[PDB]
C-alpha cells in the first residue's frame, strides 16, 4: 500500500470505523454482556359474577368457579360469555338433531351411526321432532341441543368488567435472579384500586377484559356474542447492571381471529353429570367464551468478561479488515 | 505488494463467481433482503363423534364429544378417551386393599399406618379377606377398591379412529401486523362440510381423521388405543408476505411420541366424577387409556426491508475483497 | 507485504490461528454436527393419600383423582396442599362478606351489583352477617366463603410423600429418533423402589415433591400454607454420533417466587355441582397448592457433509484474514 503521503483520507475512515464498533457493536447491541433466558410460570383469576335469567330455569348465578373453566388457573383460559344450556339429558331414544337428516318414512333411515357428525346409533325409525319435520330416532342424549337459536344480547355481557389479575412468576436461573409483575412499585393500596393502562397504569397487574379485547382490536359485544382469541404477551427486557428495580415487565394484546363468514367465533361443548332420583343426567353447555392465551417471553443480560473481550477481539478484526478495504478501494 | 502482470482470467473467473455466490445464496436464497418475525398463534380443537359402549352391569353408555375430551374447552394437548376400566359407587369406608399393596394372613401381619409406596390408605390394623384365596389389609378409603389387572383387549372406545377433529390455529404476525388463520380462503364452506384431510389429495383440508393422524405419526390405532400413546402435530407457516397473503398457506406433520413397550406403555390416567346419591357423597372413577394429541404451531414470516439489504450488500462486498485477496495470495504464495 | 526472513513471530500467530479453526471452531462447537430441535409430551402421575379430618364434614380422603385438578395429565399442573371448604351452596338471599362493606342500615345498601369484587346482585337490604357487624342482603350462594381463618397446619401436608412419576418423550423429527425419560439403564425393579437424587439417582422417573420443593430452594411447610410455584426443566442435550444409549435427560429444579407481603403463594377456587334433595347445590373449594410447570428443551447433533465444509471454508478464510492483520501489525 502506497503511502505518499496519503493525509486523513483514509485516517478519517478509521476513525469512522472505530467509533461505529465502540457505538453499535459495543454499546447499542449490548456486547459486554452475556443474555440468557427465563422460566416462567402464569396464574391467572377472574373475580366477578354475572346473574343470568333463563327462561325454564330462572335466575342462574356465575362465579369465580363458573366462567373459569380450567378453574386451576393457566395461560390458556376461557371466560364464559354465552351459554346455551339443555338440561335433563338422560340417555334414551329420541328424536335426532334436523341438520343430522330428514326422514319421512322410517324405511328411508338405516340402522347403524352416522359417519359424518354422529349424534347417536340410528334405531332405524323416524320419529316426528316437531309437527313440522321428521327425524330419524337414535339412542343417546335424549334432549338434543339446538343451537340454532344463538341469544343476541350477550348473556354474561358483564365480562367486560370481570377483573382479570395476572401473577407472573419469572426466573433468570444463569444469573439466579427471581423476579414478580408485582414490581415493587406496585403494593396493597395500589391493588386495592386500579385498572390496567396502556400510559397511565403500566404497571398494574388487574387487566380489565373489556380493556384487554379493546386493546386487542375487536369489540367487546360482537366477539362475546360468538367468541374470540386474545393473546397477552409479556415482555421482560431488563439489563442486569444496573438496580433491580429498573426491570418492568411490558404488556401488549394482541386479537387472533378471522374471517367471520367461515366458523366465526371460539365455542365448546361441556356437561356436568349428577344423579337425580336414582337416574344418571347431566346438563350440556354449549359455550361461546374468549379465549385469553398469556405467552411470557423474556432476557436479561449481565457484565462478563469473556463476551466482552470476544467482541473487543473481533472489533479490532473488522476494524483492520475495513481499514484494508478502504485502502484498496482508494488504491483500486 | 500484489503482482499485477497479465495475470489473466484465472483471478478474474474467482472474483465473478464469488459475486455470483454473494448475489445468490447469501442474497436470494437466505433472503437477504427481507426481515422476519415470528408469531402469536392459538390452537382450538374440536372432537365430533359419539361413541356406544356396552358395559356389563351399567349397559349402554353414550360418550359425546364432552365426554371424551377432557379438557372440554379445547388445548394444544388433549387427550381422547380409547379405553376405560370404570369403578362406580365409591364410598368412603373400611375395606379390603387391593392385593398388589399388599396381603396379610393374620391381621397381626399388617401396621396401622400409610403406606410409604403407592399408598392406597390409612391402614386400620385388620386384615380383610379380598377374596376367598388371598387376605389383604383393612385401609379406610374408597370402598370398591379400583381392579386394573384386567385391561379389556377389545378397545370400549375403538370407533376413535373415525371420530373427526377440527383445528382452528390463528397466528398473527406483529412486525408485520398480519393475522392468519388455518381456514385458508381456498378452503370454503361446502369444502367443510364433506372433507378429510390427506397428504397430497388434501393437504389444506382442517378435518382430520383420528385414525389417519395415528397412522401418519407411525403408530397403530389399535395396539395405541389398547394402552395409550402420544401423537404430536406440528403447524409450520414459513411464508413470504412479498407475495400475495393468500400463497401463505400452513403444513401440517404428523409424529408419533413413543417409547419400549416394555416398560410403562401407553399414556393412562385415573380421573373421578363425584356426586351425592341417597345423602351420602360417592364418586365414579375411571382410569381411561387416551392418545395424547399435543399441537405445536411454529411458523416465521418475511417482508421486504432497506436496513437488511443495505447490509447483506455490505457484507457481500466485505467477503468479495476478502475471497479476492486470499484468492490473490493463494496464487502468488 | 514484506517477507525477507521475518522469522516465526508470524509463524507462531498463524500456527495458533490454525489451532484455533481445528479446535474451538471445529471440534467444540460441534462444526461438523447438524443441530435439531426435539417435540416433547410431558406425563405426570401422582401417587398418594391424605386423610384430612375437618370439624362438620368427618374425614375426607383425597387419593390421585382429587389433589390432581388436571386429572387428564397435563404438564402445569397443581397438587392440593390446603383448602378451605364451604359445602351446601344454594342459591338464594344471604348475607355478604363483611370485606364488601359494612352497612347498618338498609338504606346505606343501593341496589345492583359491585364494581370491584362483586360478591352478588345486591337487594337493597342490610341483613346482619352475625351479631355483631352487618352486611348488604344479595343474591348468590348463600354459605358466602370466609376465608379470614387459614388453617396453619397444612391439611394435605402429606404431600411431600405423594410420589410424582414423569414420563417425558421427545422426538427429533429432521433425524427421525425416538426418546423417552425411562433409559435403558432404568428397568423395572429400578421403577419398583427409587427416588430421584442430584447424584444418587439421577435417573430415577419418580421425584418426590417434598423433595423438588427442598431443590428448588423453598420450604415446603412455609409454600404449602399459601401455595408456591416450582418449575421442573428436562434438558436432552445429546450428541447422535454415539451411541443413543448415552443419551439421558437432565433434571433441573427451580422455584419461582416473589414477595411474600404482597399477594402469597398460589391460590385458586373450584366447586363440585350436584342436585341433593331435588336441590341444585354445589362444594365450593378454596385451594392453595403448589404449581408444577415441567419444560422441556433439547438438542441433537448429527453429523453433516456440508456444515462440516462451510466450517472449513470459514476457518480457511478466518486464517488468512488473522495472517494478513498480524502480518499488517508487525510491519505497521
Ligand atoms: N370436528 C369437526 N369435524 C367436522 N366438521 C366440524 C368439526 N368441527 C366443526 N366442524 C364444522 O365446521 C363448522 C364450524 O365449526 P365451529 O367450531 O364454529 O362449530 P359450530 O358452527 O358451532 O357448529 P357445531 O355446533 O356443529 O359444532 C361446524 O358447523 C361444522 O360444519
Ligand atoms: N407416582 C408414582 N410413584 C410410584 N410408582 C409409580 C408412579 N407412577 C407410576 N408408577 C409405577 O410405574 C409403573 C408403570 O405405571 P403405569 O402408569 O405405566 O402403569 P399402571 O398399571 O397404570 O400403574 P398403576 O396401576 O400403579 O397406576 C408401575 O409400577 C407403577 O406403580
Ligand atoms: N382479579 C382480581 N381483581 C381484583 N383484585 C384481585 C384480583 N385477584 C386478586 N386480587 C386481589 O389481590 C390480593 C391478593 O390476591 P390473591 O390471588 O393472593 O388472593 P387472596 O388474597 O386469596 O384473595 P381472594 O380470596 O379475594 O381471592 C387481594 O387484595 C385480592 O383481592
Ligand atoms: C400509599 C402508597 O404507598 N401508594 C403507592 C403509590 O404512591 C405509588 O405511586 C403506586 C405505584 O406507582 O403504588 C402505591
Ligand atoms: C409431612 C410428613 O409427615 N412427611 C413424612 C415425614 O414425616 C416422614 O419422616 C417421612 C418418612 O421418612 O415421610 C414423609
Ligand atoms: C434388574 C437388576 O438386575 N437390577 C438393576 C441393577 O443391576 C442396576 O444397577 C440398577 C439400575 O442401573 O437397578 C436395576
Ligand atoms: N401441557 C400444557 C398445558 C397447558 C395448560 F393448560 F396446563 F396450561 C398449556 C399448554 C400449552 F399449550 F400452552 F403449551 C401445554
Ligand atoms: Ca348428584
Ligand atoms: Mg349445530
Ligand atoms: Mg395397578
Ligand atoms: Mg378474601
Redesign the interface.
Known sequence: ?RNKKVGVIFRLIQLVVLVYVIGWVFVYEKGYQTSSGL???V?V?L???A?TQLQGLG???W????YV????????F?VMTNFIMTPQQA?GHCAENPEGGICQDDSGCTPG?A???????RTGNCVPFNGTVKTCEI???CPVEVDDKIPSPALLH?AE?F?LFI?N???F?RFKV???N?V?E???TY?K?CLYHKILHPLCPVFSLGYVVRESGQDFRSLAEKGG?V?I?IDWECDLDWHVRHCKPIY?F??????K???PG?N?????????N?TNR?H?FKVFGI?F?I?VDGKAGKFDIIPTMTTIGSGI?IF???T??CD?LLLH
Not at 373453566?69 to 390458556?76: K, M, Q, R, Y
Open positions: 500500500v422460566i416462567s410460570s396464574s383469576k373475580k366477578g359474577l346473574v335466575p342462574q348465578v362465579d369465580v368457579a363458573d373453566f380450567p378453574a386451576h388457573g393457566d395461560s390458556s376461557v340417555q351411526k359417519e359424518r357428525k354422529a349424534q347417536g346409533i339412542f343417546g342424549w358483564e368488567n377483573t401473577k412468576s419469572i426466573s436461573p427471581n423476579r414478580r408485582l415493587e406496585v403494593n396493597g391493588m384500586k382469541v393473546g404477551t401488549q394482541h386479537g387472533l381471529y378471522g374471517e363468514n367461515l366458523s371460539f365448546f361443548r361441556f356437561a356436568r353429570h349428577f344423579v337425580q336414582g347431566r350440556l379465549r392465551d405467552l478484526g483492520g479488515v475495513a484494508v478495504l484498496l
